[PDB]
Write a protein that binds this ligand. Sequence first.
Ligand SMILES: Nc1nc2c(ncn2[C@@H]2O[C@H](COP(=O)(O)OP(=O)(O)O)[C@@H](O)[C@H]2O)c(=O)[nH]1
Ligand SMILES: Nc1nc2c(ncn2[C@@H]2O[C@H](COP(=O)(O)OP(=O)(O)O)[C@@H](O)[C@H]2O)c(=O)[nH]1
Ligand SMILES: Nc1nc2c(ncn2[C@@H]2O[C@H](COP(=O)(O)OP(=O)(O)O)[C@@H](O)[C@H]2O)c(=O)[nH]1
Ligand SMILES: Nc1nc2c(ncn2[C@@H]2O[C@H](COP(=O)(O)OP(=O)(O)O)[C@@H](O)[C@H]2O)c(=O)[nH]1
Ligand SMILES: Nc1nc2c(ncn2[C@@H]2O[C@H](COP(=O)(O)OP(=O)(O)O)[C@@H](O)[C@H]2O)c(=O)[nH]1
Ligand SMILES: Nc1nc2c(ncn2[C@@H]2O[C@H](COP(=O)(O)OP(=O)(O)O)[C@@H](O)[C@H]2O)c(=O)[nH]1
Ligand SMILES: [Mg+2]
Ligand SMILES: [Mg+2]
Ligand SMILES: [Mg+2]
Ligand SMILES: [Mg+2]
Ligand SMILES: [Mg+2]
Ligand SMILES: [Mg+2]
Lengths: 133, 133, 133, 133, 133, 133
Amino acid sequence: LQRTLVLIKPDAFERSLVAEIMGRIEKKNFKIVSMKFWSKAPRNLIEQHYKEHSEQSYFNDLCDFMVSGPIISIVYEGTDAISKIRRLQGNTNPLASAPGTIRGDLANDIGENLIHASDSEDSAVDEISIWFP
Amino acid sequence: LQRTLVLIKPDAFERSLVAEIMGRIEKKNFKIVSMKFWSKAPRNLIEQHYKEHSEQSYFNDLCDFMVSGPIISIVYEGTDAISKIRRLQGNTNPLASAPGTIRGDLANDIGENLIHASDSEDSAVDEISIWFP
Amino acid sequence: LQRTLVLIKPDAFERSLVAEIMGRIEKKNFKIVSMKFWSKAPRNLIEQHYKEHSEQSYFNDLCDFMVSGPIISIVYEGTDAISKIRRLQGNTNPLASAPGTIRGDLANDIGENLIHASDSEDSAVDEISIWFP
Amino acid sequence: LQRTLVLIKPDAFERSLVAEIMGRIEKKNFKIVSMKFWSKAPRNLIEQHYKEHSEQSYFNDLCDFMVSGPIISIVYEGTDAISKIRRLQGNTNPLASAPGTIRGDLANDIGENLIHASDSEDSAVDEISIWFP
Amino acid sequence: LQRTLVLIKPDAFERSLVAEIMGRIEKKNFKIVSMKFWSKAPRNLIEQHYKEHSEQSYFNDLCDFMVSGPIISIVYEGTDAISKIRRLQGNTNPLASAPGTIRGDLANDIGENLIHASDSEDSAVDEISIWFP
Amino acid sequence: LQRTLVLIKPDAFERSLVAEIMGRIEKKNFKIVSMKFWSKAPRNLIEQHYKEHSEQSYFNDLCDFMVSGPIISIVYEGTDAISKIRRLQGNTNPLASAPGTIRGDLANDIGENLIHASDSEDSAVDEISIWFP
Ligand SMILES: Nc1nc2c(ncn2[C@@H]2O[C@H](COP(=O)(O)OP(=O)(O)O)[C@@H](O)[C@H]2O)c(=O)[nH]1
Ligand SMILES: Nc1nc2c(ncn2[C@@H]2O[C@H](COP(=O)(O)OP(=O)(O)O)[C@@H](O)[C@H]2O)c(=O)[nH]1
Ligand SMILES: Nc1nc2c(ncn2[C@@H]2O[C@H](COP(=O)(O)OP(=O)(O)O)[C@@H](O)[C@H]2O)c(=O)[nH]1
Ligand SMILES: Nc1nc2c(ncn2[C@@H]2O[C@H](COP(=O)(O)OP(=O)(O)O)[C@@H](O)[C@H]2O)c(=O)[nH]1
Ligand SMILES: Nc1nc2c(ncn2[C@@H]2O[C@H](COP(=O)(O)OP(=O)(O)O)[C@@H](O)[C@H]2O)c(=O)[nH]1
Ligand SMILES: Nc1nc2c(ncn2[C@@H]2O[C@H](COP(=O)(O)OP(=O)(O)O)[C@@H](O)[C@H]2O)c(=O)[nH]1
Ligand SMILES: [Mg+2]
Ligand SMILES: [Mg+2]
Ligand SMILES: [Mg+2]
Ligand SMILES: [Mg+2]
Ligand SMILES: [Mg+2]
Ligand SMILES: [Mg+2]
């Protein structure tokens, strides 16, 4: 029914949490449709991915972070996959992310937060085309 | 103090999640008082269990599902066991079930949702008598 | 395709390791074909089960232990299930049971050793007829 | 940025949940700054720790409980560590503690609830000085 | 420092064990240097990969199985990675694979055995050039 | 009933495996009788602990590593605790440590190997007096 774009971020690799994160999505019965490993993502790709954040004070630090180690980009498929994976992901802010969520259990920074997931049907299409042209 | 009726549903067997589900209840320190394995539950038993749903459009599909593989029926005992296990179970709807709950972590369908737990003292008594006459 | 008889012993209930043990077998892709919960196993069934030990110095303590809490009797089905589950179980002696096995990881006593598994085709048939006549 | 005081309570030792609890805090990327194992904490220490509860009907039972087995006292450090660990801990009341939290997943009593964490900056300072003078 | 080629086989996807298998390797501190997801591996790549088996009785079934679902091809890097991952993998024969190994804990069939790993430096070079030319 | 001395080494803190290692021992039903956290172990204690290695080529690197981060010193108690925990620990050489063991599953270096355990009754007495005089 729906396809969403997930990024396993460089901090997941540094902290050896790649399997842990992918395992939480896998156990929810979401199916991998496409996947790519990036040893270092091109900065331009990152900048496109986060285009809506270009005027934010953290934009450059964010881009630096996202190129600092490997990323895995994954297209997951399932009924209402976009909203469901967003709820598994958890809130951006470590003051709010709920225990039981990926970020709530594992992330302790607003920036180094392990995982990206598309937030809407519109943005899922855009992001899938970025990472899987 | 309280006794509640839990069903491990056929999807749990298919997806090899029986131990995972029982383990979550066990780690919460609830005690098994009775347990029965059903290779295939009798349809009539299922129909009685879900009698309140007989006029629903999904009733037949639900009954078909519940006889499609094995079920384990368990009576768990503990202080406020009925409400506590309901909260561990999670919401029926995969749009609502919270990460950290059984359904929130593991279920991705409104129908194939791994687990039944009694919703009240009144229904616990009824269901216990159905599965353990 | 073989059937084997497994008992989850009273120490597993005491230490809340029931799901942990069943999980290890389930993950190995073995299927439950029968299962019974015993709040307290009748002494005669225990003495029949361990009849080969009836003249050993530890027989009375063994029987006492086996009726000291609940047990689950499970028939598991799989290709070469008997030997495979015996290998998962691990050695009776905690000085010999290998890490990775159920007893090697979890048990620390020659007597309170969490799990029984049939040791041959013939003993399997006998034990199945005892717990599931 | 912040330091908070955690107690692993005697029930965690009895139920073999020490690692499980510490593991949840560790995976959130909080750093141990100080740690002490108490075979049995002095009653006076407990009474100081829970001074605000001296006029409560459960005070004596609580103190009895807290000296009934070992405690580990830990100072954890991290950005907003006090509130973050409180959220991981979960509500005191087993009717309210959320699945995904330490208490929500593992505790089933209002009193025997596995873990203490400081509730404010003010109380963190007081408790750290009690356990680590 | 060596590179080895690992395949996550179609049975791992069917049984939702992809993260479980990758997790065991990740926890051993091995680093992904390349990775590809194959919705369906092309038959020619499979037949090249298993070319040494082309005249065996099981070749056709093997190839059929290997294209029956998705696979992930991973190049892992680490000191003595080849032999170390082979030891984690465990024996092909489910009567021989040790508990603690990937196959020993998880696989129950000589053919559907979850994971491939290069068996030598030379076979590693060959397999890497096949999946990552 | 024996007591053994365990050290959780600095690589365990770096890789966030402290609870994982302690968990494996706790699950084997061993009891903590003493424990100390060392933000940085004093060099003299390290050199005393590894005094048998003082003339080895790796002594300086070993000592450097052992003071490069925090360590926990634990005295564990159990029947045949010394040999049993040594078997859980696994071989020093990552080419020899068996899957299922702590080092076999988690360590990938001869030097950064996560855990020390006393190797005999006599070395246990010596190490206990060093870390807990
Ligand atoms: N330092 C910092 N980084 C931020 C902040 N807000 C967002 N970011 C970074 O920008 C990324 C995108 O932000 P957003 O779409 O709002 O959050 P997400 O969808 O939860 O990842 C986040 O993953 C953060 O790493 C902030 O307030 N401070
Ligand atoms: N397909 C479908 N099935 C439903 C729906 N509502 C309930 N069911 C099924 O009927 C069962 C009983 O419903 P209910 O008592 O409301 O939910 P539960 O107590 O959370 O299991 C559920 O477990 C579902 O499998 C629905 O809207 N659609
Ligand atoms: N105390 C004691 N108990 C024993 C001994 N040998 C066997 N037992 C007990 O008797 C049970 C059956 O023994 P056996 O069939 O040889 O071992 P198992 O198949 O590995 O459980 C074991 O599970 C032990 O609990 C012994 O030497 N000492
Ligand atoms: N029996 C009982 N014990 C309580 C109650 N409220 C608090 N306690 C105990 O007193 C301790 C301190 O209470 P409090 O600071 O409010 O809760 P906490 O910070 O969540 O541990 C708790 O951990 C409980 O063990 C109660 O209503 N009944
Ligand atoms: N049915 C069957 N399949 C086999 C046999 N031997 C090998 N295979 C299959 O061929 C694949 C490659 O064999 P091999 O290189 O010897 O084993 P591996 O490196 O442990 O996977 C194995 O993974 C099996 O799936 C056999 O005797 N019978
Ligand atoms: N680099 C290096 N370090 C070693 C060697 N042998 C021992 N060590 C280090 O010295 C420590 C003590 O050695 P030993 O008592 O033999 O091994 P252990 O009891 O298994 O830790 C080990 O944990 C290693 O970190 C070696 O051959 N090379
Ligand atoms: Mg976003
Ligand atoms: Mg209901
Ligand atoms: Mg036997
Ligand atoms: Mg408080
Ligand atoms: Mg091979
Ligand atoms: Mg040594």
